[PDB]
Amino acid sequence: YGSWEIDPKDLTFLKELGGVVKYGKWRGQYDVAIKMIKEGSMSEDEFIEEAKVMMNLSHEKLVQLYGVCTKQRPIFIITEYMANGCLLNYLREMRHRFQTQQLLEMCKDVCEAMEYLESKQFLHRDLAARNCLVNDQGVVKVSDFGLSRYVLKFPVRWSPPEVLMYSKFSSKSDIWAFGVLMWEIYSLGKMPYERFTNSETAEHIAQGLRLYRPHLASEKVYTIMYSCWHEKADERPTFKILLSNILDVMDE
């Protein structure tokens, strides 16, 4: 086995998470999530080459890749286990009665992950609340960064005009998605453009219209998410700038 390969005989399966994705242990002790990849769904040899690079991405707010099990059908992706599950579902649980400082911390967690990926010139390509996870300490981490490249729903609601019009993907299309994610956080997990179809959303956006302020977002927080939606990609901030903006708000 190479350094990116896990021997599946070292896994114990403990529970279904949803896929299929299972919770288990590696060598009896260490918690892991085990993603079983359905036959025909993935460009597996391309993915495995990329997994070698994903092995070296390491940031506290990025869900860690531990390795892949490649010698059989199906293959498995082994990652960090996140006990509190998907961010979208967490936001929607009304029992949490979240304070806005907790929402802002979620945004900062993601922004830190994305600033790291940006520093490595690595695009997420599908940033959204559904691709973020929550651990037992309430920390949000970004998952499945880059993964859509190996898949054989397009995220219209998280895409800037130049993606929808021309298929122009860049750092600035991740920025636009991050602004939509902040909106999802402050809206407690509402679907963006909830009364529109994808086709209507694409028109709305291309005509220069936008999401508007969630009730829980202060004017300062709204200005940060809104800055991600400039019609001109080059006038959108970087993740570094966004992180400084989010820290300034926390301080005020």
Ligand X SMILES: CCC(=O)Nc1cccc(Nc2nc(Nc3ccc(OCCOC)cc3)ncc2F)c1
Q: Is the peptide bond before 20 cis (omega within 30 degrees of 0)?
A: yes
Query: Measured on CA atoms in the order 55, 46, 88, 225, is the torsion positive or negative?
Result: positive
Q: x/- binding map, residues 8-37, to ligand X, per CB under 6 A?
A: ---------xx--x-----------x----
Min dist CB 149 to ligand X, Å, is 18
**CA atoms of 53 and 173, how far apart (whole Å):** 22
End-to-end Cα separation, the chain, in angstroms = 51
- x/- mask, ligand X, residues 58-87, rule CB under 6 A, reads ---------------------x-xxx-xx-
Does 95 sit near ligand X (CB under 6 A)?
A: no
Asked if 180 and 159 touch (Cβ cutoff 8 Å), the reply is: no
Backbone angles phi, psi at 225, to 5 degrees: -65, -40
Closer CB to ligand X, residue 143 or residue 187? 143
Catalytic residue among 7, 31, 109, 126: 126
Residue 219 CA to residue 180 CA, distance in Å, equals 16
7 is catalytic: no
Task: Measure the CA–CA gap between 71 and 5, rounded to whole angstroms.
Answer: 9
Q: Is 88 in the site for ligand X (CB under 6 A)?
A: yes
Q: Which of residues 123-152 bind ligand X (CB under 6 A)?
A: 130, 133, 143
Residues 177-206 that bind ligand X (CB under 6 A): none
Question: What are the residue numbers of the active site?
Answer: 126
Contact set with ligand X (CB under 6 A) = 17-18, 21, 33, 79, 81-83, 85-86, 88-89, 130, 133, 143
